Each structure stands twice: as structure tokens, then as C-alpha cells.
Amino acid sequence: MISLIAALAVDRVIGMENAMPWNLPADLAWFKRNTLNKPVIMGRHTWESIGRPLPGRKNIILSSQPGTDDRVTWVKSVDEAIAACGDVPEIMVIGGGRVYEQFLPKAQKLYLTHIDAEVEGDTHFPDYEPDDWESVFSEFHDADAQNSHSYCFEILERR
Numbered sequence: 177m178i179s180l181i182a183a184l185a186v187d188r189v190i191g192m193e194n195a196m197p198w199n200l201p202a203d204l205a206w207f208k209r210n211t212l213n214k215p216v217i218m219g220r221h222t223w224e225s226i227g228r229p230l231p232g233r234k235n236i237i238l239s240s241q242p243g244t245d246d247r248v249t250w251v252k253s254v255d256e257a258i259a260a261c262g263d264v265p266e267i268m269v270i271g272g273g274r275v276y277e278q279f280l281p282k283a284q285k286l287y288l289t290h291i292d293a294e295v296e297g298d299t300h301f302p303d304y305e306p307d308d309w310e311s312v313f314s315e316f317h318d319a320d321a322q323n324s325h326s327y328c329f330e331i332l333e334r335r
């Protein structure tokens with residue numbers, strides 16, 4: 177099973193200048209809980225944005241060019257990325273925009289955080305078709321001293 181996990185600001189913005197400009201510790205904690213002990217697939221730009229391997233997960237990087245770090249696994253196509261995960265129950269796709277586009281048609285589950293924040297950005301989560309997806313979990317949180325925007329955790333499953 178393939179799942180996508182992402183945090184979206186208003187208008188599906190996910191990034192600007194190869195960064196995420198907000199800081200929401202509660203969402204990063206949600207990301208860690210839902211990805212720990214699973215393989216994670218990311219594109220090369222997202223790898224550069226994170227800047228280090230994510231511990232406790234098999235890190236798989238998509239790039240058309242040879243890898244430059246043997247602490248992670250480098251693959252050259254979507255099918256190779258999936259194969260490199262082995263026989264696991266759930267593969268997590270962690271972006272970015274180009275990678276999400278390619279994996280969306282193959283995904284059964286979306287873990288989305290909706291952040292109430294207006295961000296100028298240059299990268300968006302794919303338009304998906306709402307009729308294809310059932311909301312099975314949602315949890316709203318107001319802003320607090322640690323998290324400066326309100327946010328909604330949602331899990332959707334392909335109908």
C-alpha cells in the first residue's frame with residue numbers, strides 16, 4: 177500500500193524556494209509518528225531541503241543522476257523506488273510536488289495537514305479529485321503558544 181503525507185497551506189501551497197517557511201512542531205510530531213519504522217520516498221529537491229537522513233526510516237531518494245550519499249538509497253524510477261521498499265505494509269511518499277504528482281494515482285491513503293496560513297509559494301500539492309476519497313479521520317487544533325496557526329489533521333482513503 178502506498179500513502180502520501182503532506183502539509184498544505186492555503187491554496188495547496190507546500191513550499192517556497194525549496195523550503196517550508198512555517199514552523200508547526202505539532203505537525204512535525206504527527207509526521208514522525210506516521211512515518212517511523214516505514215520506508216519514505218522523496219525527490220531529490222526534498223532531500224536537499226531536509227538536509228540529512230530521517231532516522232528510524234529507510235530513506236529512498238528519486239533522482240535521474242547517481243547518488244551522492246550512501247547513508248540513503250538512490251533510485252532512478254518510480255517502479256525502482258517501490259521495489260526498493262521491499263514487502264512492507266505501507267510505503268510513505270513524502271514529496272515534493274513532482275513526486276506527489278507521480279504517486280497520487282497509485283496511492284490508497286492520504287495523510288494531510290491543512291494549515292490555516294497564507295503562504296506565497298512555488299510548489300503545490302496535486303489537484304486531486306475529491307469524489308475519489310473518503311475522510312476517515314479528522315482532528316482540528318487551534319493555535320497555541322507552540323503552534324502559531326490552527327491546523328487540521330485528516331486521513332483520506334481512496335473509495
Ligand SMILES: NC(=O)c1ccc[n+]([C@@H]2O[C@H](COP(=O)([O-])OP(=O)(O)OC[C@H]3O[C@@H](n4cnc5c(N)ncnc54)[C@H](OP(=O)(O)O)[C@@H]3O)[C@@H](O)[C@H]2O)c1
Nearest residue numbers: 182183191194195219220221222239240271272273274275
Ligand atoms: N509541505 C510539505 O508537505 C512538503 C513535503 C515535501 C516537500 N515539500 C516542499 O516541496 C518542494 C520540493 O518539491 P519539488 O516538486 O521541487 O521537488 P521534488 O519532487 O522533491 O524533487 C524532484 C526531483 O526528484 C527527482 N525525480 C522525481 N521524479 C523522478 C523520477 N520518476 N525518476 C527520477 N527522478 C525523479 C528529480 O531529481 P533530478 O533532478 O536529480 O533527476 C526531480 O528534479 C520544497 O519547497 C519542499 O520544501 C513540502
Ligand SMILES: Nc1nc(=O)c2nc(CNc3ccc(C(=O)N[C@@H](CCC(=O)O)C(=O)O)cc3)cnc2[nH]1
Nearest residue numbers: 181182183203204205207208226230231270271289
Ligand atoms: N504533515 C507533514 N508535515 C511536514 O512538515 C512534512 N514535511 C515533509 C518534508 N520535509 C520535512 C522536513 C523536516 C522533517 C523533520 O525534521 N522530521 C523529524 C521531526 C520529529 C519531530 O519533530 O518530533 C522526524 O524525525 O520526522 C521531516 C520532513 C513531508 N511531509 C510532511 N508532512
Ligand SMILES: [Mn+2]
Nearest residue numbers: 253254255256
Ligand atoms: Mn521502468
Ligand SMILES: [Mn+2]
Nearest residue numbers: 259262263264
Ligand atoms: Mn514483493
Ligand SMILES: [Mn+2]
Nearest residue numbers: 292293325326
Ligand atoms: Mn494563520
